[PDB]
C-alpha cells in the first residue's frame, strides 16, 4: 500500500489450524495444524534411529504423536500456558510459517468477547518485551467476517472443532447483553463419537487414536438433508451403512455416526447432558430478534470458516425453520412460507476468509495510526494499547 | 405373579452361570459354563448329506462333568471372541432347564443377564426361540448390573433412600464403573473396564517360574488359583517387604501341599513373596493392558472430572462396591486412604484464590463392607423378577410379538428411531 | 428341463443388456449425496420404466429403476404354510447375512416373496457382465437349494420315531 | 493397435496440450496427477489439488494451454502451466452445487457452462474483476446441461440437457461480443434466446455434435436415442435409437458418418446421406487386443482349492465383458487425421490404460449425402 | 505406575553429549566424580527394579533418564550370566570383565540409540564417553554381586533373576544368548 | 504381513515366508561348539556355531547333527539355532504371525506337545499349523491323484493319493532320505 507488501502480517489464531501471512497474501499463505509437542515415548521397540530433531511445532509435529509430549493447554479453545506459545511464536518467525521480524513492523490479530484480558495484557507486555511491533491491531473475533463485503446486520456465526459463535448484529453493533456463543465443536463430539466405536469392539486407545476421526472429518465427512426420511431408510434398508481403511490398513465399519454425530448439535441430550440444541437456541435467538430483523433474517444472517463449507445441513435447517415458525408462531398459517424469500448465506470464499476476512481491512488501514494500537501505549502503562 | 409358576433368576456369566429356586436365599449354583464334543476331525466313512433322519452319529456331554470327557473338547459358550455358538447355547440351556434343573419354562417366569456392549442380532434371533422354542410366558434380558441394584436395597437401613452414588464393580473377564444418578448416566463416563482375573491368573502362571514345580501345565493354572486367593495381598514398599520373607519366619514363608495330577501323587511347594507380589494390577492395569494402563485411582479421577461439582458432595457421601472382587482385605483400605489423599491434593489447588483459607464444608463419607456381596445377587435378582411390577414390563410373549415378529421388517425402530 | 426359463432369463438378460444403464450425477437443484434413487424418484423422463413380469399365473418379477439405482422383487407359486413358514425359519436366518452381502432390499417382500436394492456403485467396484451372468442364475440355484432343504427337512420328519420308539 | 495402464487410475476424463503429450485426468475423488507420453510410456508430470470439487470436465484450450477446470466447487479456474505447475486462475459464476462441463466459444472468446443449478451461467472475462464474471439463463431454460457444442462461428451454441426439450439457443454478451450471423434454425440472436427446437424431450440429451462444418447436427440422449437436425433440408430433423448397450459417447467423423460407443465397450459405426429420418448404422468397429493362448494352470489350481469366482467363462477375458473390455471402457477420441482423414484413434477405461487403434483398414469407400 | 521416579536428575547435571555429568557413586573409572556409599540412581534402577522392569513404556523427563536406560537394563544384562554363576564364583571372575566390555555407541548407525543420544559431532563426545561407561559397568557388577551373593553360602534368586529376558519394554542394550 | 513357511526338518535348511517363490534361510542344520584350547586373545568368542558358522570355525569345532532315526531330537539343540533362524537369519519376530511349521508321521507322541511348549511357552507365537509333509507337494505339483515321493537327507516318504486316501498299509515312510550310502 503506502509502503512494501512485507512488514505487516495477518493471522487467524484458530483452534484446528493457524492460518497466517504478510497482510494481503493470496491465502493465509502458510497454514498448519495448531499443534505443538516436545519428546516423550511411543515405540516400545528398537526402531527409528532418527537423530534429526527433538521438539516440534504444527506442520512438522504432525508425524510424531507420542514421540512428543503433545499439548493443547486449554479451555474453550482459550489457552492456559504462556510459553510453548512462545516457542511456537519463535518458530513462526522463520520461513517456517512467516519469514519476519516485528519491531520494525506491525500486525493484525483478534480477541475473544469476554477475554479475561489481564492475561492478554501480560502476553502483550511480553510481546512488547520481545516482538515489540511499531504498531499492532486486535478486534473481537467475529467482527472481521463482515470485511470483504462491508456488512452490518444478522447474526454472525462460526464453528469448527474447538468452539462455535452466535453474535446478534445490527448496523455493525453486536447486541452485547443479548449475545450468544457455544463453547465447543468437533473435539468432544469426537469423544462422544468414539464412545460409540468402543461398543462395536473398536475399543482403541484414544491417546494414539482420537485424531483419526479428524482425518476423515477433514478430508471426507458431510451432512445429508432429507434427514428424517434418511432415519427411516437407514434401519429399514440397512445397506446404506459405510466403512473405511484406517490407513494403517484396517477397514472398520461405520454407520450413520459419520453425520449422525451432528444430531448431538440439535439434541445435546444425545450425550445425556441435556439439550434442545443449537437449532432451538436459534429459534429463541430469532424470537428475541425484533419484527423487522427476524423477517429480514429469512435471507439476512451470516456464517464463517472452513466449518461452513458444508453440504445438506443448510437445506435441512431451512426445511426445519419453516416449521417451528409455522408451528409455534404462525400456529397454522402457511400461505407465505416461500414468499418469505429465503436465499442462502455461506459462499465458497468462507474457505479463505479465515484470514482474508481480516486482510480486506489492512488493504485500507496499514497507513492508519488511526487504527494502530501500540507498544508505546503498553510502555505508557496506558489503560489499553489503542487509539 | 406367575404363569402357573413365578419368576426366577439366572445370571448367565462368561465363566460360570449362577442361579437358585423360588423361596431360597442364595444362588444354589455357581457353575462352569462348559460342554464337551469330539473335534478330532477324521471325517470319514459310509457318507450321507441333506437328510435329517433318525441318528447314530452324535457324541456329546454338557456341564462340569463334561470337563472329564476325553477327545470331547470341553468348549465354553462364554463370550470371548467365541460368540457364534449362541446356536449351541439354546440346546445347552434346553438341557439345563429341562434336564439339570428339570423344570418347565412355559410355566415359570424369568430374568436373565447381558453385558452393556451387546449387539442385537444374537439376542433377537434367540427371541423367536425364547417365545417359540422356550415359548416363555414372560422374561426380560437385563444388563447384568440390574441384579446388583436389588442388593443395594437388601441393604436397607436409614439413608438407603436415593439412587445417587457410585458402584465400583470387578470380575474375571470384565470390571465396571457407572455414574448413576437416580438411574441416569453418561456414555463416556460410565466405564466398561476390560482388565479382569483371566488376565492376572496366566501372569501368575509365569510366576511359577520363580519358585515351584511338578504339575500338568493345565492343572498348573488350577493350583495357581488354589493358592492365590487365601494368601495374596499388597505391600507399602517392595524393598521393605522382601526382607520379611527373607528372614522373619513362616508368617511370611508359608508352605503349601497338593498333588501332581500327572498321576495323582503329592507335591509340597513354596509360599512367600508371591503373596504380596500377585494382586497389584488394580494400581497397575498395565499388567493386563500396557497399551492403556490407567490405574484405579486415575480411573476414578477420570470419571469424577465429568461428574459435575454438585454431585461430588453426594459422591463423597455415597461411594459403593460390586462383586467378590470388591469384598477384598485392605488393598481397598490402602487404596482408599491414598485416593482420599489424592482428592485432598487435587482439591487444595484452590488455595491459589483465597490463599490459606484451607477448610472443607462438612460432607459425608461411607461405602459397602460385606461378604454378603457374593450370595445376595441371585436372591435379590429373583425377588426383583418376582415383584408384581415386573411381569408386564418385562417382555411377555405378546410384548415380544410386538417387539420382534411384528417389527424388524415392519418399522424396526421406524427406521433408526424415525 | 424347464426350458421356457431360457426365454425367461435370456429376456431378463436382454433387458439387462438393453438397460445396463446405472451411472452417476450427484446434483443440480438438490444435494450431491447420491440417494436410494429408486426410492426417491420424483419424476419420469430422466429414469427407467416401472415394470412387472409374470412367469405364469402366480409367478412374476417386479423391477423398478431410477437411471442409477433399481429394485427387484420376485414371486413364487408355493403357498402352503409347510412351504412358507418352514423356509421362513431360514428367511429369518437369511437377513443378517444380507448384511454380509449388501444388495438385498432386505425383506421377504409379499405379493412377491423377496426384494433387492441395486446401484451404480457396483459397476465401478470390480467387474463386468460375469456379474449379472452370475447373479440372475445364482438366483435360480438358491431356489434349487429349496429341494436340498426339502429332503433335509423331510428327513427331519424321518427323525421322529427313529429316535423315540427306536430307543427300544 | 496398442495399450498400457502404467498405473490403474479410474480415468474419469482425459485432456491435453494439442500435441497430446501431457495427459490430465479426472481422478478418483479429489486427487489429480497429470502424466505424460514418455515416448509411449506414461510417467507423472504434475500434482494438482486446488480445484477441490473432485474433477468433472475441463476445457483445456490446448494451443493457449488454459485448462478451464470444473467440478463440485466454485474454486473453478483456468488452470494454466505457470512454467512450474498447472495452477489456478479463478472464474466467477452464479451456478450452484457443481460445474459438470465447460466449453470455449471456439475462437476461445469465452466459454459456455453446465451448472449444478438448472442453468447456463454464461461467463465472460473481466480484466476489472481480475477474473471472469457471469450472467444467467435461469429461464427460458428449466434444467441444466450435460454436453455442449458451439457452432463454428463461436457465438452460436448447442447443448444436451436435463431439461430434455431438444432446443437450439443464442447467448451473446454485449460486454465481450456482438450478435451472430442469420442462423437458419432461428435468427433472434441476443442473450438467452431460442432459435429452434425438435419436440424431443426424448431422454436427457447426452451428446451433441456438429457435422464437419455444422450444416447439420447430431444428438443422442443417455436413454440412447440417436438423432439429427439438418438446416439445408429446410430445418429438417431425424431420430432413432440403438440396438446395443447404453451410450457412453458419439461423434461425427464426417458429415455423413459417426462413431458411437456404449456399455458394450466396443465402438459401432453409423452412416447416412440426407434422407431426413433415414438414420443408419455400420456395425462394430474394433478387434480385441487379446488372443486365446492366455493361461497359468498353477494359480488356476491353487485357487480352485480356494473358490473366488472359480468356475470359468470368457466373460473374464474382459473382466466380465469378454473382448478385453473390462469392468468398463470409459472414453474415446481421434488422435490424428481428424473427422475427415483419421490416421489414429484412442480410448480410455476403468483399468487406467492408454489405448490406440486400427483406423485406416476401414478407409474403403467414396462420397456421401443425398437430398432426401 | 510412575517408577520410584528418579530423584537423581539434578541441577548439577552438566552433560557429555545428550546425557548427564554428575558427582555420583560409581566405584570404577570414567569422567564422573563420586559420592558416599549410597542407594542412589542405581537403586532407583535396582532396588525398585522390582517396580520398574514390568513396565512396557514410561514417563521419562530428561538426560539422566536417557542415561538410566543403561542403569536399569544393564541389570538384566547381568542376569544373562548370573544363571551360569549358579555359584557366585563365576561372577567373581566377571567383576573384572564388566568395566572391560564397553557397549556400542552414537554416530554408529545400526546402533539405534541416535534416536535419543548425540553423535560424536566432535570425537571428544566419544573420547570422554568411553571412559565414562567403564566406571558404571563394573560399578554395576560389584554392587549386584556383593549385594546378592556369596558363592554357595548364599544362592541365585530366580524369583527376580528370572527378569533376565522379561525386561522393561522387554528391550535390551546387548547380550541375547547369555 | 505374512506367516513363516519352513522345512523345519532334516537336509539343508529350506525356509522363507508365505507367498514367496523361495526360501532364503538355506544353510546346514548343525550344532558346533569347539574342543581345542581358546588361545589367541583377539579371537574372542561365544560357545557354538551353526552351519555356515560351523564351516567358518570348522577345524576347531565339535560339529553335531541332532537327526536320530531322522528325528531332529533334542530341544536345546534347536533353541539357539531357532533364535538365530528368526532373529538373525530371517531378522524377524516369530511373534509377528501364525506359522506354517510341518511334520512327518510315526514320531513318538508327546514330542509335539513338548515342541509346542517351546513354540508357544518359549516362543509365544500367535498361532501355528504343522502340515503333514507330503501335503506340501500338492500345490507345487498341482496334483491330487498320483504318487508323491520324498528324498533329500533325513526322512523318506512315498505317499499314494487318489483325491487323498493316503494309505496306512500301502504308504512307505522311513528314518532317512539319502544319507548313509556315503558310509
CATH 4th-level superfamily of the largest domain in chain B: ATPase, nucleotide binding domain
Beta-strand percent range of chain B: 15-25%
According to CATH, the fold-level topology of chain D is Methylamine Dehydrogenase, Chain H
The radius of gyration computed from the alpha-carbon positions of chain B, rounded to a whole number of angstroms, is: 25 Å
Structural class of chain B: alpha+beta
| Chain pair with largest interface | C-D, 24 and 35 residues
Strand ordering within the main sheet of chain B = 3-2-1-7-8-14
The CATH architecture of the largest domain in chain B would be 2-Layer Sandwich
Given the structure, what is the number of helices of chain B?
14
PDB class: structural protein
Keywords: Actin, Arp2-3 complex, Cytoskeleton, structural protein
Entry title: Model of the actin filament Arp2/3 complex branch junction in cells
Chain A: Actin-related protein 2, Arp2
What does this structure look like?
The structure is cut from a larger assembly and holds chains A (387 residues), B (418 residues), C (168 residues), D (372 residues), E (178 residues) and F (183 residues). With 387 residues, chain A is an alpha+beta fold. Chain A folds into 3 domains: 4-140 and 350-387, ATPase, nucleotide binding domain (Nucleotidyltransferase, domain 5); 141-184 and 274-349, ATPase, nucleotide binding domain (Nucleotidyltransferase, domain 5), CATH 3.30.420.40; 185-273, ATPase, substrate binding domain, subdomain 4 (Actin, Chain A, domain 4, Alpha-Beta Complex). Helices cover 29% and strands 17% of the residues of chain A. In chain A, β12 and β13 (173-174) form a beta hairpin. In chain B, the strands form 4 sheets. In chain B, strands 3-2-1-7-8-14 form a 6-stranded mixed beta sheet. Chain B is globular, with a radius of gyration of 25 Å. With 372 residues, chain D is an all-beta fold. In chain D, the strands form 8 sheets. A 4-stranded antiparallel beta sheet of chain D has the order 1-28-27-26. The longest helix of chain D has 6 residues, at 297-302. In chain E, β1 (14-16) and β2 (19-21) form a beta hairpin. Chain E contains 6 helices and 2 strands, in the order ββαααααα. The two termini of chain E are 30 Å apart. Chain E has one domain (2-175): Actin-related protein 2/3 complex subunit 3 (Arp2/3 complex 21 kDa subunit ARPC3). With 178 residues, chain E is mainly alpha-helical. Chains C and D meet through α4 of C and loops of D.
